[PDB]
Amino acid sequence: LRPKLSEEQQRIIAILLDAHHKTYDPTYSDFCQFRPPVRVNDGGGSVTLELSQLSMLPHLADLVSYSIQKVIGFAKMIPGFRDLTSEDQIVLLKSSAIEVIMLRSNESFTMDDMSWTCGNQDYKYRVSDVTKAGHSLELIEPLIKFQVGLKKLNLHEEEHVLLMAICIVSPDRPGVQDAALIEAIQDRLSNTLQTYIRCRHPPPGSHLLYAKMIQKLADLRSLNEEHSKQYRCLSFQPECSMKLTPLVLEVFG
Ligand SMILES: CC/C(=C\C=C\C(O)(C(F)(F)F)C(F)(F)F)c1cccc(CCc2ccc(CO)c(CO)c2)c1
């Protein structure tokens, strides 16, 4: 059966697409406002050198901080999100932050050279740039694999924004109070996504796509955990706080 999208589901998709268009700048025009990227010589991927310099951290931290602000903006536009208490809203935002950033960054990710390309050489981010910010291959390699896998799903923008919404409105996040309400909102979103795939996504992929998308959400949980561990290590580096931002410190601290 291929039921048609209800008027409510059509509205949801329209709202989410609009929300994304208002919070994701495909030209990355604000990136020049961040502290400048600095790339020190580290062909050997020396952890000691990377930690002593953290050359790319100010720039990446500003980019992630900027991204978190956009995600907060996007989340506020998710139908039903504002029906949640402020406490639950913040809990969901802090816990899904890095995951949603990983998902949204897929738009700049390119398989041409496996990088996040946001402009000229200066704003092209490779595995080496992320290691220069203090992260290790234990996170980066799996992240790249995740980006490629997501790219290969060839998601429609409608599916992309629904996936980000579903990621944010997860009832299984530690600290949530009204799990039932959150689950109701997520179910409304998941049903919209399943209905959309069944009647708008052409084969080969009309089906099976939903399961693959849900598996990406599970993958994100593992990446989230690894990122938290790496952030912990990074925070132990003296003077690291100045290289971050108040928003980043609160969300991951
Ligand atoms: C390895 C994971 C990570 C960031 C980690 C950052 C921090 O741990 C620290 F400290 F290092 F700064 C933080 F800030 F969290 F604390 C990361 C995840 C996904 C991508 C990228 C690459 C860059 C890119 C990001 C976001 C968007 C859009 O938001 C776009 C443009 O699409 C490009 C990096």
From Swiss-Prot:
Family of this protein: Belongs to the nuclear hormone receptor family. NR1 subfamily.
Top-level taxonomic group: Eukaryota
Gene from which the chain derives: VDR
Molecular functions per Gene Ontology: bile acid nuclear receptor activity; calcitriol binding; DNA binding; DNA-binding transcription factor activity, RNA polymerase II-specific; lithocholic acid binding; nuclear receptor activity; nuclear retinoid X receptor binding; nuclear steroid receptor activity
Protein keywords: Cytoplasm, Disease variant, DNA-binding, Metal-binding, Nucleus, Receptor, Transcription, Transcription regulation, Ubl conjugation, Zinc, Zinc-finger
Short motif 9aaTAD, span: 246-253
Posttranslational mods: Ubiquitinated by UBR5, leading to its degradation: UBR5 specifically recognizes and binds ligand-bound VDR when it is not associated with coactivators (NCOAs). In presence of NCOAs, the UBR5-degron is not accessible, preventing its ubiquitination and degradation.
UniProt GO cellular component terms: chromatin; cytosol; nucleoplasm; nucleus; receptor complex; RNA polymerase II transcription regulator complex
Protein name (database record): Vitamin D3 receptor
Domain comment as written in the entry: Composed of three domains: a modulating N-terminal domain, a DNA-binding domain and a C-terminal ligand-binding domain. The 9aaTAD motif is a transactivation domain present in a large number of yeast and animal transcription factors.
Effect of R104L: In VDDR2A; loss of calcitriol receptor activity; decreased affinity for calcitriol by a factor of 1000; no effect on interaction with RXRA; changed interaction with NCOR1; loss of interaction with NCOA1; no effect on sequence-specific DNA-binding
Disease / disorder: Rickets vitamin D-dependent 2A: A disorder of vitamin D metabolism resulting in severe rickets, hypocalcemia and secondary hyperparathyroidism. Most patients have total alopecia in addition to rickets.
Keyword Ligase listed: no
Result for mutant: H135Q: In VDDR2A; loss of calcitriol receptor activity; no effect on interaction with RXRA; changed interaction with NCOR1; loss of interaction with NCOA1; no effect on sequence-specific DNA-binding
Subunit record text: Homodimer in the absence of bound vitamin D3. Heterodimer with RXRA after vitamin D3 binding. Interacts with MED1, NCOA1, NCOA2, NCOA3 and NCOA6 coactivators, leading to a strong increase of transcription of target genes. Interacts with the corepressor NCOR1. Interacts with SNW1. Interacts with IRX4, the interaction does not affect its transactivation activity. Interacts with CRY1. Interacts with CRY2 in a ligand-dependent manner.
Residues the record lists as binding calcitriol: Y24, S67, R104, S108, H135, H227
Part of the whole protein covered: 120 to 423 of 427
Cystine bridges: none
The NR LBD domain, residue ranges: 8-253
One BP term from GO: positive regulation of vitamin D receptor signaling pathway
